[PDB]
Amino acid sequence: KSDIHPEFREDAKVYCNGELVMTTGGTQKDYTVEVWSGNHPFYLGNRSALLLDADQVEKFRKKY
Amino acid sequence: LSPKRTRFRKQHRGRMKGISYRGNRICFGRYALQALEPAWITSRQIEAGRRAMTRNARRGGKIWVRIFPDKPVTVRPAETRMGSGKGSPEYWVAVVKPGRILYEISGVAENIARRAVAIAASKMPIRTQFIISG
Amino acid sequence: HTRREDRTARHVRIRKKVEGTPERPRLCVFRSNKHLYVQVIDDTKMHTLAAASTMQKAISENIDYSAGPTVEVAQKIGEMIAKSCLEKGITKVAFDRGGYPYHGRVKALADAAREHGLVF
Amino acid sequence: RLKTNYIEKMVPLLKEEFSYSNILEVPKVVKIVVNCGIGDASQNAKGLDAAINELALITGQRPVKTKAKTSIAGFKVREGMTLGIAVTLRGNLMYSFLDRLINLALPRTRDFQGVNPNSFDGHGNYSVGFREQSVFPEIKPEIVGKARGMDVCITTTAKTDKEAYKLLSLMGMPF
Amino acid sequence: VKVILECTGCVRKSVNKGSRGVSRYITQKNRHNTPSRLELRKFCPYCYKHT
Amino acid sequence: TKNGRDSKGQRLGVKIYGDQVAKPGAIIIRQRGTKFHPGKNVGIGKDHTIFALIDGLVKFE
RNA sequence: UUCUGGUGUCCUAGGCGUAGAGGAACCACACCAAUCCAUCCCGAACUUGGUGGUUAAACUCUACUGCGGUGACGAUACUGUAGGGGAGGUCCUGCGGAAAAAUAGCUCGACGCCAGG
RNA sequence: UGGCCCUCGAGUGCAAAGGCAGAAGGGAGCUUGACUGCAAGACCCACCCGUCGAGCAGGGACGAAAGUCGGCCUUAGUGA
RNA sequence: CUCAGUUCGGAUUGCAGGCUGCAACUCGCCUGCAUGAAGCCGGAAUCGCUAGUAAUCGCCGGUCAGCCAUACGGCGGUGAAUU
């Protein structure tokens, strides 16, 4: 229908802070995007947190 | 004894008919009390016969009360007789026709069930007998 | 739920209101994805009077590569169903839509049936 | 553009993974549907306008304020009241917003659970639901101080034990 | 309240074939004024029968 | 002190039975609701009564 | 002259399910776009115009009594008349009619019109 | 809000009964037949009453047409 | 920064340390990071003070291995209004 629907643009520029640009179709023309799923720390964030931070004995030996 | 919910408060009477061909068989229990005589049996005689044969067995076995009243009888007061105003919370009544099993019993030997079923048949306005599970 | 049961349910919905009479027959259509069908039938004797189809006009003007039902072949089969029952004694007819809503090629099919003077 | 990535690579390995015999028996995603569960939108008039403008910029098209199926006592619900504002988008918008669930919901969730093998498991026709990301990053987020409801139900054609979970697994939904 | 009330046409006291005022019984009007198109007046086509 | 005696007196029923000669306009069935649906050569009424359109017998199927 | 598929009508109503088959033709889904048209949003539905592949879904045909529907005979309750018993509740006879439920079975419909090949 | 199952158990301004599943139940468009003059024949029938009605003319409403509409699914809501 | 629960406020909690002392969990202090609670001058009532006083800012001592001391005992700095 006309006159009610928002402008669904085909040229939507997805800009990453790591100098990567991909094309998607959406509302805005430009999208400044953070941690988006390709090269996201979901393989290393669960490696750094809940998997390696727990220590009580090797913390004790570093002060003696 | 008495139904909890009643679909209709007062309900008029209904006349006895021939031999009940459905409720004549024995479902549970080994022995039974078959009625030869069509009349009404209130919940009061059912309490009397139930206490009679439960306390006449008194060691083992279980009885089976078959019938439930499901219809009321409205007794008018002594108020010079014209209306059927309120008689619904008064005594309930079970219709029994011939053939129908009234009581059953199991876990009891021969003559202990003969005195159990036969003594508890004296608490009852209609002539009966005891029936073996054939 | 499905589309075919929806069409059949719409056609039974239409059939309650319109009935074939011995004075006025009823012509029903079927717009299959390859072919149209049109049936001048008489319900009180339970037999057809004048049936045509895309397999009748398709001797001369058809393209099976294209989507078979077009508005132009609806114009043509309304033309031949308008001149096929006129030579039989069928002037005053009771048109129903065949379970399909009227805004389509059945516009020009019905008006094409009106083009040869049929009392619609 | 992920429909072209949907065509040639992730359909034939579902064709040979289940060991079919024909092409069209392989299932596909049918439609997704978003609702905004709101109990107070006749009073909050600018929250319903926030659903129209803001939620119409969340999804592809304008959402629909939903009239009440019945009136339940206790709540402020009458016959025909706005109980949530929903939208049903479908087509290439469907691929574009499951795409926006790959891009805008999978790496930007504070939790790291993703698709769940213990949720949306058993259905007659398999449906996947999420309660996440009340505002997309296209909308200036700090205006709406209310965590409004938002559910995105995906639909499929399959009636199996494997195929929808592998369908979201082949797309950008790790866990 | 359900007030009974009469609809009426445009009067036109004339010497035509039985030309005269036409009022019709109607109900329910506890609202804005509703002229309905009750017709077959003494003049045979008619519209906007007032009150 | 009774809350009764509220009879109605209203009557209905089948007026013309099957294999019987009907008249044009003869009321065949007076009914509450539709126990008898209108077949052919009949008509349904304003209060769902069934009248005959033409002469002849009446049937049920 | 069978199949195919629009169409009905009688119907014991013919359905669910398990199995096998059909894409020459026909019917049906699927992909592309939207000009009339359209969905209180979506070409999901409806419409128009085409690529035109499959039987996957849906239709059609053939089997099964596992459910479902239907359903006996004989009996028996009941009942119309003519009577009899009982204190009552109520029962029994002569003749006529005759159940219901259950069971043995029956049923995966049957007849017509028109257009291909 | 999405999907399967049972398929009429929901609903119909209100009491019950009989109805009604591609509906008489819910929605949307246009609407004023909630007209005029009537009316063959029926039911109910102490009378008074009361109920249904094919069909005709005028002038229309909807629909593309076929057709339908003389208030409401019906029975109560009244007074010579 | 120039009006905010804020570069106000610092509570509570976590991680990592140090010191004292046989020993620091219940129950010591202190450092480094993390969090940033309540609290926008206080109802009814109520208290101290007539001048180097009030208010305000620090320093020291005692006991003491170390400390719960925001207390106590002192000592200066700035320094009023009112009767």
Curated annotation (Swiss-Prot), chain A:
<comment type="similarity">
    <text>Belongs to the bacterial ribosomal protein bL31 family. Type A subfamily.</text>
</comment>
<comment type="function">
    <text>Component of the chloroplast ribosome (chloro-ribosome), a dedicated translation machinery responsible for the synthesis of chloroplast genome-encoded proteins, including proteins of the transcription and translation machinery and components of the photosynthetic apparatus.</text>
</comment>
<protein>
    <recommendedName>
        <fullName>Large ribosomal subunit protein bL31c</fullName>
    </recommendedName>
</protein>
<comment type="subunit">
    <text>Component of the chloroplast large ribosomal subunit (LSU). Mature 70S chloroplast ribosomes of higher plants consist of a small (30S) and a large (50S) subunit. The 30S small subunit contains 1 molecule of ribosomal RNA (16S rRNA) and 24 different proteins. The 50S large subunit contains 3 rRNA molecules (23S, 5S and 4.5S rRNA) and 33 different proteins.</text>
</comment>
Swiss-Prot record, chain B:
<dbReference type="GO" id="GO:0032543">
    <property type="term" value="P:mitochondrial translation"/>
</dbReference>
<dbReference type="Pfam" id="PF00252">
    <property type="entry name" value="Ribosomal_L16"/>
</dbReference>
<keyword id="KW-0488">Methylation</keyword>
<dbReference type="GO" id="GO:0003735">
    <property type="term" value="F:structural constituent of ribosome"/>
</dbReference>
<protein>
    <recommendedName>
        <fullName>Large ribosomal subunit protein uL16c</fullName>
    </recommendedName>
</protein>
<dbReference type="InterPro" id="IPR016180">
    <property type="entry name" value="Ribosomal_uL16_dom"/>
</dbReference>
<dbReference type="InterPro" id="IPR036920">
    <property type="entry name" value="Ribosomal_uL16_sf"/>
</dbReference>
<comment type="subunit">
    <text>Component of the chloroplast large ribosomal subunit (LSU). Mature 70S chloroplast ribosomes of higher plants consist of a small (30S) and a large (50S) subunit. The 30S small subunit contains 1 molecule of ribosomal RNA (16S rRNA) and 24 different proteins. The 50S large subunit contains 3 rRNA molecules (23S, 5S and 4.5S rRNA) and 33 different proteins.</text>
</comment>
<dbReference type="InterPro" id="IPR020798">
    <property type="entry name" value="Ribosomal_uL16_CS"/>
</dbReference>
<keyword id="KW-0150">Chloroplast</keyword>
<keyword id="KW-0934">Plastid</keyword>
<comment type="function">
    <text>Component of the chloroplast ribosome (chloro-ribosome), a dedicated translation machinery responsible for the synthesis of chloroplast genome-encoded proteins, including proteins of the transcription and translation machinery and components of the photosynthetic apparatus.</text>
</comment>
UniProtKB/Swiss-Prot annotation, chain C:
<keyword id="KW-0150">Chloroplast</keyword>
<dbReference type="GO" id="GO:0005840">
    <property type="term" value="C:ribosome"/>
</dbReference>
<keyword id="KW-0934">Plastid</keyword>
<comment type="subunit">
    <text>Component of the chloroplast large ribosomal subunit (LSU). Mature 70S chloroplast ribosomes of higher plants consist of a small (30S) and a large (50S) subunit. The 30S small subunit contains 1 molecule of ribosomal RNA (16S rRNA) and 24 different proteins. The 50S large subunit contains 3 rRNA molecules (23S, 5S and 4.5S rRNA) and 33 different proteins.</text>
</comment>
<dbReference type="GO" id="GO:1990904">
    <property type="term" value="C:ribonucleoprotein complex"/>
</dbReference>
<comment type="function">
    <text>Component of the chloroplast ribosome (chloro-ribosome), a dedicated translation machinery responsible for the synthesis of chloroplast genome-encoded proteins, including proteins of the transcription and translation machinery and components of the photosynthetic apparatus.</text>
</comment>
<keyword id="KW-0694">RNA-binding</keyword>
<keyword id="KW-0689">Ribosomal protein</keyword>
<dbReference type="GO" id="GO:0009507">
    <property type="term" value="C:chloroplast"/>
</dbReference>
<comment type="similarity">
    <text>Belongs to the universal ribosomal protein uL18 family.</text>
</comment>
<protein>
    <recommendedName>
        <fullName>Large ribosomal subunit protein uL18c</fullName>
    </recommendedName>
</protein>
<keyword id="KW-0699">rRNA-binding</keyword>
From Swiss-Prot, chain F:
<comment type="subunit">
    <text>Component of the chloroplast large ribosomal subunit (LSU). Mature 70S chloroplast ribosomes of higher plants consist of a small (30S) and a large (50S) subunit. The 30S small subunit contains 1 molecule of ribosomal RNA (16S rRNA) and 24 different proteins. The 50S large subunit contains 3 rRNA molecules (23S, 5S and 4.5S rRNA) and 33 different proteins.</text>
</comment>
<protein>
    <recommendedName>
        <fullName>Large ribosomal subunit protein bL27c</fullName>
    </recommendedName>
</protein>
<comment type="similarity">
    <text>Belongs to the bacterial ribosomal protein bL27 family.</text>
</comment>
<comment type="function">
    <text>Component of the chloroplast ribosome (chloro-ribosome), a dedicated translation machinery responsible for the synthesis of chloroplast genome-encoded proteins, including proteins of the transcription and translation machinery and components of the photosynthetic apparatus.</text>
</comment>
